Amino acid sequence: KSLAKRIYEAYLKNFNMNKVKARVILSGKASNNPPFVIHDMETLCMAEKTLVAKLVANGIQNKEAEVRIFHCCQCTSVETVTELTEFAKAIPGFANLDLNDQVTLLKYGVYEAIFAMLSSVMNKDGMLVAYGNGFITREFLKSLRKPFCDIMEPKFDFAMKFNALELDDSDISLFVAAIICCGDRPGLLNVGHIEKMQEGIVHVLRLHLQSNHPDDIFLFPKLLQKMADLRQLVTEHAQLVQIIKKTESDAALHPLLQEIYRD
Numbered sequence: 001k002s003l004a005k006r007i008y009e010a011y012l013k014n015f016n017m018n019k020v021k022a023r024v025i026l027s028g029k030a031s032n033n034p035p036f037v038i039h040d041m042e043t044l045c046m047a048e049k050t051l052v053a054k055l056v057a058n059g060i061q062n063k064e065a066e067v068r069i070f071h072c073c074q075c076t077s078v079e080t081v082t083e084l085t086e087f088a089k090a091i092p093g094f095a096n097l098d099l100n101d102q103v104t105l106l107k108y109g110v111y112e113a114i115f116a117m118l119s120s121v122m123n124k125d126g127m128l129v130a131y132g133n134g135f136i137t138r139e140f141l142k143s144l145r146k147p148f149c150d151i152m153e154p155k156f157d158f159a160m161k162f163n164a165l166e167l168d169d170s171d172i173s174l175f176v177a178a179i180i181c182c183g184d185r186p187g188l189l190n191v192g193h194i195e196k197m198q199e200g201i202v203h204v205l206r207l208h209l210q211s212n213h214p215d216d217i218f219l220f221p222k223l224l225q226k227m228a229d230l231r232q233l234v235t236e237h238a239q240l241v242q243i244i245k246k247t248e249s250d251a252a253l254h255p256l257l258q259e260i261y262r263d
């Protein structure tokens, strides 16, 4: 409970979007600057005009939507990986890890953490983008050509099963820290120091859930399973991005993300 509060602090401090902010928009007004809704190329075109005006002047609307939606995804992945880094530095004992240990835990935990947190900004109909000023629909996303249609569906699939657990952000902050401090990660130099960390977070997490959701007895074991799915989800996800990199003409990877995929 003592450790929990600081992780819940670091969580709120370091992420521009959270479940409360996201439901505020997904649930309704949001009376000022309401999300643009994106269901087709026309509204996609409308949103770019408003939001990324510099790009539109640069001629991006000549490119197919599959590629602009994909480059939009990378930019957000890059925003979040930066936020995930600053968040980890605020988890106790993380800064004290050897720097190669710090670099390693983040290489493997971020896409798992990204996908878990993505669930907070989704409902069955769609997901928020552009810092809450855009809402792109799941169906427009399925409308897109292969392999581009295949990226978001597995994550929408998880989000509904995940959002159904009805976690609050205090839950999610401990959950995201635990993903990060996994000691099973390859290439670690000081595994005991790190396993020692995971042992701590998971205790407070087991304890917070017990208090936060006294009614849901099976919630904790259910969450541990959620961690395994994300690894597979991330593994399958990686397989898809490799297919796109070798295959699609304008699917350039961002350099930061390219560092993530080296192993």
Ligand SMILES: Cc1cccc(Nc2cc(Cl)nc(SCC(=O)O)n2)c1C
Residues within 6 Å of the ligand: 047, 048, 051, 052, 055, 060, 067, 068, 069, 070, 071, 072, 073, 075, 129, 130, 134, 136
């Ligand atoms: C969902 C959404 C909201 C706002 C703008 C856009 N269009 C974008 C966004 C980004 Cl980050 N990049 C592009 S094209 C980039 C390039 O020429 O490499 N197009 C999109 C796809």
Ligand SMILES: Cc1cccc(Nc2cc(Cl)nc(SCC(=O)O)n2)c1C
Residues within 6 Å of the ligand: 070, 073, 074, 076, 077, 078, 080, 114, 117, 118, 128, 129, 151, 152, 155, 241, 257
């Ligand atoms: C918070 C948020 C909302 C929407 C999209 C994303 N980034 C994603 C999500 C998914 Cl399922 N796929 C991609 S493709 C490029 C990449 O490998 O980061 N990018 C993120 C990080």
